[PDB]
Amino acid sequence: QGLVYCAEANPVSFNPQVTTTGSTIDIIANQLYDRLISIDPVTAEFKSELATDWKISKDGKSVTFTLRKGVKFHTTAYFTPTREFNADDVIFTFSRLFDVYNPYHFVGDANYPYFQSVGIDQLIRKIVRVSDHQVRFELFNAESSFLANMATDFAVVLSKEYAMALKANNQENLFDQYPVGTGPYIYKEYRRDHLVRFYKNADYWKHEVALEQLVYDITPNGTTRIAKILTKECDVTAHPSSAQLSILAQRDDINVERETNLNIGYWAFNTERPPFDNLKVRQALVHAIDIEKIMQAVYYGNGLRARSILPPTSWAFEPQKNMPIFDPQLAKKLLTEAGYEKGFDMSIWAMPVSRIYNPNARKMAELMQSDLRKIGVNVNIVEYEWNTFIQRIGEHRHDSVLLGWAADTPDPDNFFSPLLSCTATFSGKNPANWCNPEFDLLLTKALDTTDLNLRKQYYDAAQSMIIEQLPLYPIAHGMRFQASSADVEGITLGPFGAISLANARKK
Which residue pairs form cystines in this protein (predicted)? Predict the structure, then answer.
């Protein structure tokens, strides 16, 4: 039998390297590929995947991975391996990111957003081929977040043989669209905006794959995904719409999982755009927002009010004594003295699809529209297709935007470096358009040591600065929901990272 997964958006690629969008990763990462290592969701220990062992040198500048033997790349319609996975694949996959000499470095858009955001460039010097199944990464500096970053869904292992084959034909452009991985499922078919079809990898190293067929039904409209699970057109529904959770909860033949998760939903300001470059203005706007009405109207009481950018389950979490309080008269008192008495107009960009950190950006933007009108700020709401939306936010076309982050790892740097750093900004991934080298220095020092007490000192200072400067305003942390037919089991959500159907089965 097969499984049909109702997906909230079209995948932007079949290579996880080129995106930080969860919608795409949820489709491709755990299904077609494996990483070197992963992070246990419960102990947070690193777990062997395609790497069997890993070692960090005394100085933190050399990391040796021992690699699994006997791992086969996919046989697909367009590729058949002549050898198994080895060190050459690791060196190719990862040198593609930092080595301008890698023939694939500039393929596609030449963007590797997660990696550029956390500064691969100033990190990886080379990867030595110590043997057929062992490599050693040489870093320019120690970074205590390094393995965490190597365990993200973006850090999958690719096929060098496939890549070198396509190159021979000058068909490099095909590499990222027609994927070859080592994962539990293999690429079969893709109808743009309509569907993706995968089939079971009979030669999968890790386990005997249960499902024969996996189809993703690309259905951006939230209520339609609900409708499709009800009619059993879909077996699993991504990001179920809050308004319909109660409907699903009553159905005997449907399960809805509800898990805690490291995420943040925020209101980001384009800090390079007047009047939003003015801290007093940013402060004025935040005080106008009825956060407690959002906690109910939007989050349906399922969310946790934000006390810092970090969710309270982050080990570095520290509640900020200076979080703004909802006070509309104070907001007015601040705009004038900014000194926007007649106030001004602004846009709030709102996500078109439900995310863990924000199940209804539209509803949230409408609530804020009402709130701000009252101090005299005239909000217009902007919304586009999810992937288009991300792109135009990366081009900083907005005044402000409702966005957030679903953590890829339980390493706190993951809430900072990929979001608010200068490198993040230069990669078009910082919704606040905020380059603050002073802030970044805190991040670097936190990465200069593995001592957790020291890291948290810097992370403490970082959380405080974000509240002081308000490049963005932490709003809430959501619960991670997923609906599925009671016929399904083995599906993994987790407190971080992308969805996995690696162990899914029916009946």
Answer: 6-234, 422-435
Question: For the stretch 162-194, what's the b/e string if a residue is b when 16 or more beta carbons lie within 10 angstroms of its beta carbon?
Answer: bbebbeeeeebebbbebbbbbbbbbbeebeeee
Assign 3-class secondary structure to 415-469. Answer: HCCCCCCHHHHHCCCCCCCCCCHHHHHHHHHHHCCCCHHHHHHHHHHHHHHHHHH
| Separation of alpha carbons 463 and 17, rounded Å | 28
Report the residue count for the chain.
Answer: 507
Distance in angstroms between the alpha carbons of the first and the last residue of the chain: 9
Nearest CA to 485 out of 309, 240, 158, 141 is that of 240
Helix (H, G, I), strand (E, B) or coil at 393: helix
Q: Are strands 480-485 and 62-67 parallel, antiparallel or unpaired?
A: unpaired
Joined together, the tokens standing for residue 394 give 């990366």
Binding-site residues sit at 20, 22, 355, 357, 429
Within the chain, all domains assigned CATH 3.10.105.10 are found at: 260-478
CA torsion, ordered 431, 465, 266, 414, to nearest 10 deg: 70
Q: What single string gives the DSSP state of each residue in 293-325?
A: HHHHHTTTT-SEE-SSSS-TTSTT----TT---
- Side-chain half-sphere exposure of 338, counting CA atoms within 13 A: 24
Task: CATH 3.40.190.10 in the chain: give the residue spans.
Answer: 1-9+181-259+479-507
Residues 482/226, Cβ–Cβ less than 8 Å: no
- Method in brief: X-ray
Instruction: Please state the φ and ψ torsions of residue 483, each to the nearest 5 degrees.
Output: -100, 145
The sheet with strand 263-269 has its strands ordered as: 304-305, 472-477, 263-269, 400-406, 345-350, 378-382
Strand partners, 37: 48
Give the right CATH number for 260-478 from 3.40.50.1980, 2.160.10.10, 3.30.1490.20, 3.10.105.10: 3.10.105.10
Q: Which helix (H) or strand (E) holds 387?
A: helix 386-394
Strands 472-477 and 480-485: what pairing?
Answer: unpaired
Q: Are 166 and 125 in contact (CB under 8 A)?
A: no
Return the half-sphere exposure (C-beta side, CA atoms, 13 A cut-off) of residue 22: 22
Domain 10-180 has CATH 3.40.50.300: no
Token output for 504: 């899914």
Peptide bond into 339 cis (omega under 30): yes
Q: Which CATH class is domain 1-9+181-259+479-507?
A: alpha beta
- Phi and psi at residue 207, to the nearest 5°: -155, 170
Q: What is the largest CA-CA distance in the chain?
A: 71
Q: DSSP letter at 386?
A: H
Tokens of 433: 């358009």
Any residues with CB less than 8 A from the CB of 408 and at least 6 apart, and which? Answer: 114, 152, 153, 154, 414, 418, 496, 497
